[PDB]
Symmetry: C3
Subunit: 52 residues, 3 copies
């Protein structure tokens, strides 16, 4: 006896979850960086406004 | 088939996480592009200043 | 084997969406770094001219 299709489906789901976990953490990091860069750019323009 | 059922559940878990990751990555791209445009504006103001 | 086959297909979908989300996240990280560096150029130029 063998449960091969189910075993392979389970391995595929575990692999997919590892990939998706890593993508989530990468994406959240990228969001933080992107907002920090937006704030840095805004601050540069703010300093120029204030110096007008 | 208990293993197949659990594999199905775990695949839905993976989809929920991948969908959230995609949403967040799309927002990060849009914000980073906005940051590039705004930073270019500050440098253009500098280039063209009196 | 319908259930296992469905779980496998759903897992493949999640896996592919996760790969694209990781690529998009890197693209945003790259753009954010460029914007960060350009904002620092802008400030530098402004302080040198002030």
């Amino acid at each position: 006896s063998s449960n091969a299709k189910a075993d392979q489906a389970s391995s595929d789901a575990q692999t997919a979850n590892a990939k998706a976990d890593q993508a989530s953490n990468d994406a959240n990091a990228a969001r933080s960086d992107a907002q920090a860069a937006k704030d840095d750019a805004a601050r540069a323009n703010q300093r120029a406004d204030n110096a007008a």
